[model samples]
Target: SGALCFRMKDSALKVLYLHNNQLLAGGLHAGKVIKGEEISVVPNRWLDASLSPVILGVQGGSQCLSCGVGQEPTLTLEPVNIMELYLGAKESKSFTFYRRDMGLTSSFESAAYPGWFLCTVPEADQPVRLTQELGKSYNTDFYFQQC
Candidate 1:
């Protein structure tokens, strides 16, 4: 379904679930999702536009920008899919957010593999990937809001 498969609420961004260390993008054991004060959102010429959604990027120290295979210390999922953190999804190391300006908070669905979403399994250390089944959990849901 290319169309919106799920609808989200506006209050998801009000909490600190994804903002703090309590819950990370890829979960524990993996890289931590840190919003760098020096370089929060990097602009891509193609993704740069009035309608171009904000692209969020996450680096594990000084190696987040180097996009490559899965779990190789790259970007993390959602809350910042607005920015094209990587050249493309195939090269994106970690996960990126899927919410637009005033849009829904969601995980970036891979174009290479459709129907799969980047999910984080709460209460455990899980590898992030484009999962077909996000499962039923409070942590599986996407939540984000603009301050």
Candidate 2:
């Protein structure tokens, strides 16, 4: 069974994947998680730092997600601070960049922005370590053996 812990004015409850009784940080931000059901969670900073707002699987798909057919399902991870481990030429980046493009250079605000955009890396051959830039995006796609 799974339990979903979140707040939505009236203390919303959603289902979560079955796992150990891991300590979820706040008193107002946790609920008993149940499996095979859907639940929403408030992004709790203390839990993972980058704080992903939504998580837990929904419905009965073998894969837990709620996107329309042909669309990629939601990615569940505690924030992926790629910039820390990865010294890509950009200012900062994360796994989200691997999934979806960050759009064109954010021209509106500060130079602090990397002004980058994203492109699809294809689901068939992925979770691949990305490149420094377009120069070496698919450097090892063919060499690695598939699972």
Candidate 3:
């Protein structure tokens, strides 16, 4: 049997915003946790659909967006490839997210931990974390704008 070649596409640089229109940016916190800032502009990020939809920064680094138990979402600087991830040739479970499309907006759920979603608080300068709450205190819906 022959393996099918998977052609993945990377989205253009885009700015991510919460449902309330707050900009999502990399925070200066420990582990490089993502946060919601009130700034007008920040560095755009790439949505790499190569393997299970990985979010990437501008440097073309293959850091994994990871969230541990009772922890916030952070970037783990680990090199990975689509083929390795697709074939389970590597330990990259935390690097992937399941995108939930909602027409104009979308939500991202952790592939490693189901029922937990990438979320942010209503206040500014808050670190983005994973929450089980959907339509409650956390804002999980996100909108993207090409940069």
Candidate 4:
């Protein structure tokens, strides 16, 4: 009359079914399980990483960082590099891949990508383009912090 739980292989998802109440620990969604963390999704309806970046300085701190009228600052979710994107069940860490450098944030601009929260490109093409261009934005050395 308490709680019951079990563990599964990371690759055993093929046989797993979602419980209507499956709120995965660490805030994972169905998409994340299928597409490993190799992918960085802004997580529209999925992994919504603090929107405060877009809302922190709005309305003298009462509101946030959304562009007014037609003047919106663009945000990009670039897939840079990381060996692991998961925090150990009881710890926190990230494994990075030093061989890859990604640009053009994924586009969370559409319903088709409710889980993907950025655009690599505006025009759907061989490689895709960012609907909004990203220039020397957030220029700083790479680092990671705990959640």
Candidate 5:
């Protein structure tokens, strides 16, 4: 409704889990997101990019998913509007991600830095980080559990 031609319906909030479903990304503290039992995310999509660009954010929180200049994936407190972004009115490229759907799971690659995927450690209670490894070492694939 603000920009882009796609429908503006709200997407359901979801919790993201690793392929093993043991650890999840959530609980924002000190400008860092950690692996927790539950974390709500707003999965927004548009037809702007051929790779299927997405905007990840907290359901009712201010922080949105963003990639840093150092190739680190982090949360940003800045307001995000997909419409404004589609119209090129906002300089929020760091908040965008290229979503890769893999049937039961999906992977999020940083739009700002290609080849960098959002990943979590094998252990529990760790800070979520970005990695270039796609060889099944770090947990990169995520499962979206709708809430």
Candidate 6:
């Protein structure tokens, strides 16, 4: 099924998906998705215009990944751009997904948060957050699979 499209056998069997008009995006507990949920990843033109060697997720010209407190990170069509830039804010709307090895695994780092990387807080709520280090855990490395 489409929901199981990016399944990874990392204990909890996490799955990666983009769905519901970009409302949800991330490595979620496989049980949260059903048998046929489907979504696609498109490019965020703003970040691409900079021509940086960073791979990111975008849908409808807006950034796809959003992190906050109290819940798992979700995909939002927020521009996170000039609306705040001229006001002296560092929150850029771009994120870079980098390959870590010869497999379907990578790290998601934000251009706005500089040295921080996307990581899962597996305890107390499984909320996603940006971390400064990729310690000895499966929180930072995300498994990417082909469709």
Query: Which candidate comes out best when scored by lDDT?
Result: 5
What are the models' TM-scores? 0.37, 0.17, 0.52, 0.17, 0.60, 0.46
lDDT scores in order: 0.34, 0.23, 0.45, 0.20, 0.53, 0.41
Q: Determine the C-alpha RMSD for candidate 2 after optimal superposition of all C-alphas.
A: 17.4
lDDT of 2 by residue, 6-95 (tens): 221101111122233221212323463322222222122222333232222222111221211222322233322322223343222122
| lDDT digits (tens) for residues 50-113 of candidate 1 | 4332233333212222212453233233433323344463333233223234344544433323
Winning candidate number (TM-score):
5
- Provide the lDDT at 68 for model 6: 35
Q: Quote the positional error of residue 115 for candidate 4 in Å.
A: 19
Model 5: how far residue 60 lies from native, Å? 2.2
Judged by whole-model lDDT over C-alpha atoms, candidate 3 comes out at 0.45
Model 1 residue runs over 4 Å out of place are: 1-55, 59-104, 125-127, 137-140, 145-147
Listing every candidate in turn, what is its Cα RMSD in Å to the true structure after a full C-alpha superposition? 10.1, 17.4, 11.1, 18.6, 8.8, 8.1
Which regions of candidate 6 are displaced past 4 Å? Answer: 1-12, 16-63, 67-92, 95-102
Which residue runs does candidate 3 get wrong by more than 4 Å?
Answer: 1-58, 69-89
Residue range 1-147, candidate 6, lDDT tens digits = 112223322223444333553322244445554322222222333454342324233332234354432333332344543223223354345433322343555555555455567665545223345677667553766655434
Preferred candidate (TM-score higher): 2 or 5? 5
**Candidate 4 TM-score versus the reference:** 0.17
lDDT of 1: 0.34
Q: Clashes in model 5: which pairs?
A: none
- For 64-89, candidate 3 gives per-residue lDDT tens digits of 34554344554333444434544566
